[PDB]
């Protein structure tokens, strides 16, 4: 039904469209297979003398019609998401007889995760820490338009042919559902998402880069995580992590969200850290890490 659901809301839905004649969406060709998501590669006829490759996620046509809205309401945020360092929508074609469309640009390398999981990859201590850089960077835009992720990870961050890192999300909650090893603490108590708590899971991210994607906290159990780190604890240095960027890791995770660096003053201190290495260090896997989900 078109007529409808939010007739002067769901207006905006008119910019992201695609014309007559510029789609082509191949299932033979499956970029993966997610859950209640379409992941699949797709090739797209920008207006002309450009050849645009992209991951296509456009839902069913009679699915429904109440859980239709809240799809095609969460690819409308990414409308103002123009930043180098996060991922935007190229667009949303509604087909008359086919279904209502979806566009992301096709990132090369995939998932941030699996990406630095692959033995066939060296990257350097350089290289790792300039992944977080970069992630710090996607923040402090999102920050500044007061926009709170709620699932800040390495799984949901992207990768292109140029190795620019793109901050994105993978289209219950209490107990288990929920991502509770990158939530910090007055989150797992009230269960109330802000930007300070967005700073206590870029510190666990920031822990995933140094070990080359080991999971955190594989020996204690997410029913039992507020009572694990109420007795005084927090994730352990790396081998290959220098002192002060533990020193930072640290203060993300502080007790009063207040007293946490902003996503600012982060991109500002990791800069520095960066800048006073050249490439001559590179990260090897913890044996103890391998072969661990
Ligand atoms: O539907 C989304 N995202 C998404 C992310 C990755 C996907 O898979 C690929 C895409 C391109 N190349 C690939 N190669 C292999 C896998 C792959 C993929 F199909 C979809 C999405 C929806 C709404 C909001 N936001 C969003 C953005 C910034 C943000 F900061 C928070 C939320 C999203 O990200």
Redesign the pocket.
């Known amino acids: 039904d078109l007529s409808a659901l939010n007739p002067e809301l769901v207006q905006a839905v008119q910019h992201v469209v695609i014309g007559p004649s510029s789609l082509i969406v191949h299932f033979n060709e499956v970029?993966?297979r997610?859950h209640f998501?379409?992941?699949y590669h797709g090739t797209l006829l920008d207006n002309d003398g450009k050849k645009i490759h992209?991951?296509?996620?456009s839902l069913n046509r009679i699915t429904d019609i109440g859980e239709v809205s809240q799809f095609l309401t969460?690819?409308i945020?990414?409308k103002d998401?123009s930043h180098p360092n996060?991922?935007?929508?190229l667009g949303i074609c509604l087909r008359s007889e086919g279904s209502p469309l979806?566009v992301?640009?096709?990132?090369?390398?995939?998932?941030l995760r699996n990406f630095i999981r692959n033995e066939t990859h060296n990257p350097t201590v350089k290289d790792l820490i300039g992944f977080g850089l970069q992630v710090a960077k996607?923040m402090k835009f999102?920050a500044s338009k007061k926009?709170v992720?709620r699932?800040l990870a390495a799984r949901?961050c992207?990768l292109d042919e140029k190795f620019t890192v793109?901050?994105?999300?993978?289209?219950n909650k209490t107990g288990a559902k929920l991502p509770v090893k990158w939530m910090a603490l007055e989150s797992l108590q009230t269960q109330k998402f802000t930007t300070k708590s967005d700073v206590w899971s870029f510190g666990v991210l920031l822990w995933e880069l140094m070990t080359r994607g080991a999971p955190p906290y594989p020996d204690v159990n997410t029913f039992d995580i507020t009572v694990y780190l109420l007795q005084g604890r927090r994730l352990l240095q790396p081998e290959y992590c220098p002192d002060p960027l533990y020193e930072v890791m640290l203060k993300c995770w502080h007790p009063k969200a207040e007293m946490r660096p902003s996503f600012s003053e982060l991109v500002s201190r990791i800069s520095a850290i960066f800048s006073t290495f050249i490439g001559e260090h590179y990260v090897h896997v913890n044996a103890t890490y391998v072969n661990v989900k």
């Open positions: 970029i993966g997610g998501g379409c992941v992209c991951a296509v996620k969460e690819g945020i990414m998401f996060v991922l935007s929508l979806v992301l640009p096709y990132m090369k390398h995939g998932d996607g999102l926009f992720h699932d949901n992207m793109k901050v994105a999300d993978f289209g």
